[PDB]
Amino acid sequence: KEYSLAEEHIKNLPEAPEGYKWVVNEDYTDEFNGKRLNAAKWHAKSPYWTNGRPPATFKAENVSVKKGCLRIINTVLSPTEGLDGKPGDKYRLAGGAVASVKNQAHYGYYETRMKASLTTMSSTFWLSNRPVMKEIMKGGKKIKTWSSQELDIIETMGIIRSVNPDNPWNKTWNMQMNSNTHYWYQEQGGKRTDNTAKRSDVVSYMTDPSAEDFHTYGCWWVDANTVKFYYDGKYMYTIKPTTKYTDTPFDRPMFIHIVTETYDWEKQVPTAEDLKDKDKSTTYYDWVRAYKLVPIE
């Protein structure tokens, strides 16, 4: 009965193209309705992003499954830490970073029912992959280059504090469908460039306060050029990821990341008191559900 709720949820997906049908992808699907995180399917501590963005990192102990939800709680980290669990002054907050074990999630549909923590740390649901090396020539010099991709289905935080009055871009960030795509590109000796694309065919960015209730945040990753975002089952907008470096920028599969983090643009990170209420300091995921398109007959 581990996949029944997800099968039933096909009702709510966008209509499959003619000739095709939505099919549960078991590998990235979880109702979290058991007594623990399924260690066959998930890494409680992501092996991919090992040290968080200071001053928060990620601990396995901050990830649990209880009463129908994946719970990623934000806590004071004590003692303070440097890199890789060592003592140091880099980290004083602990969040969670969950990664699917398998990393072959490609074209298809991905969605979570999430309630954000009432906290200035992120509640997120996204996919990513690792960098792949490609050799290039300039004249007559070989240059190593690397690329990877990253698909952000939702980023929010429950509380907004650092609002520049002159540029209040993040004023309503807890009420906007913040989704995104990144084609990461780097040449050896050069800087890592974050290559982004504008939203197209827009219906809405408008969303409900992320910490007040559970909402549905979903992506139809249609093909290598096209990703479409859904809030509470309604189409929001499209992003065509940038073709700067390749005609087919999203032609590589990904793993799922489920992450609780701290951002440099919100320096009023949770204090001890901010995090004293455990319910409030927790991001809740009722489920994660993934689908594949398959020909009907």
Active site residues: 150, 155
- Residue closer to Ca ion, measured from CB, 250 or 287: 287
Q: Which of residues 154-193 bind Ca ion (CB under 5 A)?
A: none
Q: Least distance from C-beta 67 to Ca ion, angstroms?
A: 8
Residue nearest to Ca ion (CB): 68
* Distance (Å, whole) CA 287 – CA 215: 11
What mask, x for binding Ca ion by CB under 5 A, covers residues 3 to 32?
----------------------------xx
Q: Binding segment for Ca ion among 60-68, 86-94, 175-183, 209-217 (CB under 5 A)? A: 60-68
- Say which residue the tokens 């002159």 belong to: 166
- Residue closer to Ca ion, measured from CB, 31 or 152: 31
Q: Is 135 annotated as a binding residue?
A: no
- Residue closer to Ca ion, measured from CB, 33 or 243: 33
Count the residues of the shown chain that bind Ca ion, applying the rule CB under 5 A: 6
Q: Is 169 annotated as a binding residue?
A: no
- Residue closer to Ca ion, measured from CB, 180 or 282: 282
Q: Least distance from C-beta 282 to Ca ion, angstroms?
A: 14
Q: Does 111 bind Ca ion (CB under 5 A)?
A: no
Q: Which of residues 65-94 bind Ca ion (CB under 5 A)?
A: 68
Q: Is 7 annotated as a binding residue?
A: no
* Distance (Å, whole) CA 141 – CA 1: 58
Q: Least distance from C-beta 114 to Ca ion, angstroms?
A: 11
- Residue closer to Ca ion, measured from CB, 173 or 287: 287
Q: Least distance from C-beta 51 to Ca ion, angstroms?
A: 30
What mask, x for binding Ca ion by CB under 5 A, covers residues 258 to 287?
----------------------------xx
Determine how many CB atoms are found less than 10 A away from the CB of residue 67.
Answer: 9
Q: Least distance from C-beta 32 to Ca ion, angstroms?
A: 5
> 70 and 123 in contact (C-beta within 8 Å)?
no
Please enumerate, by residue number, every residue annotated as part of a binding site for substrate: 49, 53, 150, 155, 261
**Residues at the site binding Ca ion, with contacts judged by CB under 5 A:** 31-33, 68, 286-287
